[PDB]
Amino acid sequence: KKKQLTVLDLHPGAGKTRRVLPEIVREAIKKRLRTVILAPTRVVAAEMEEALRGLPVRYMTTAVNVEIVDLMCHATFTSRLLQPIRVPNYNLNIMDEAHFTDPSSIAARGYISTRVEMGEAAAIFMTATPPGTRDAFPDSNSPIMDTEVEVPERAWSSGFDWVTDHSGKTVWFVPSVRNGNEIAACLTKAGKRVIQLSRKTFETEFQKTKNQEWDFVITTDISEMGANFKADRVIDSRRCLKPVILDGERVILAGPMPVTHASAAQRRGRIGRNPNKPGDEYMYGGGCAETDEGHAHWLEARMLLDNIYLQDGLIASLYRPEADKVAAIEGEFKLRTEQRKTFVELMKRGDLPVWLAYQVASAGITYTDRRWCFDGTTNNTIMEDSVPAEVWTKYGEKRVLKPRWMDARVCSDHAALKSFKEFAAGKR
């Protein structure tokens, strides 16, 4: 029904995606409701075509090889809202894995919930862990053995025999890509077969969990968003890096620090999913805390939402239960037409973090002008192998990487640094 936002918060594995979602879609088709289904990732979008097989759904992603029901990724929806492209005023908005804390997912939730509040649409947010969840140990299809235990975050030689004595398969949530690299190298030296997953490698590398033999999957928090494993153990550091905007001028990666209860419940929720296989184990290495408070993703969500047309001059609010996570003045990030296009291109083609893309576009810099990558303060020098990183500019001059605005996420691992060096050199 219109003006209704429903939170479908069945416990993990209860069947929200494979049982309830197809029933909702069939009903929406019957009622001739223009409907959008929002999948967190391309991998999950492919899994949804399997669950929705038969039904007339337009899949707006090349991730599926195959209507009044559209399916697209969370980020695609928000990106299309930001661009001149026409987006239907969907009568029914279904967000699967609606706990995703990516800035584009938060922004989408704010847009959708505002259209519902205005009485223009209906929405269903599907997630075991709605915003504000305080339960890290929800129900599961089969019982879980929960154990609080010290979990290594560096290479080890002794004192953690329980890690390597296990003969099943383990999903291990690490605080960072670099921390996961070190743990992976340690496990590999101990004779284990390890697959590593992160945000930017997920679609490629996740397939290895089906196609290869493995003993451990080392993953950051991307695997909290519908990623399905045939494991019988989760090792959870219970730690994450928190992007924080410091003194309004830079972004640091603070911590590692506790994950939220929702994140911990989602990580544990990778196991206990088979009602016929009890005895899955969850080993956790710390407590939870509300570390989404002040987390840059919710500031970045407001930067996105301030630039989405809703109606005349109105600006969509964040979804009420997560609106308190950021201190921001509504509309303070609204950009005019040309600066907004630069903003969008810096985020898409530029592959820059939202906060950084905003600093560049709001300064009046055009997308291809990379002088700002070199004219920052000395304290903004980016290091590679303990020496200042250097690139050849598009002019042919070798220069130290020293961006005017420093966002730790452009150089937090080797791959991110490689990408930002390519950006500073004008190569995309």
Ligand SMILES: Nc1ncnc2c1ncn2[C@@H]1O[C@H](COP(=O)(O)OP(=O)(O)O)[C@@H](O)[C@H]1O
């Ligand atoms: N490809 C598959 N074939 C059979 N069962 C599956 C498949 N994928 C998931 N399942 C199982 O179906 C049940 C419901 O899954 P799902 O709808 O994803 O749960 P939820 O979305 O509520 O977390 C779970 O036990 C899950 O382990």
Ligand SMILES: [Mn+2]
């Ligand atoms: Mn689901």
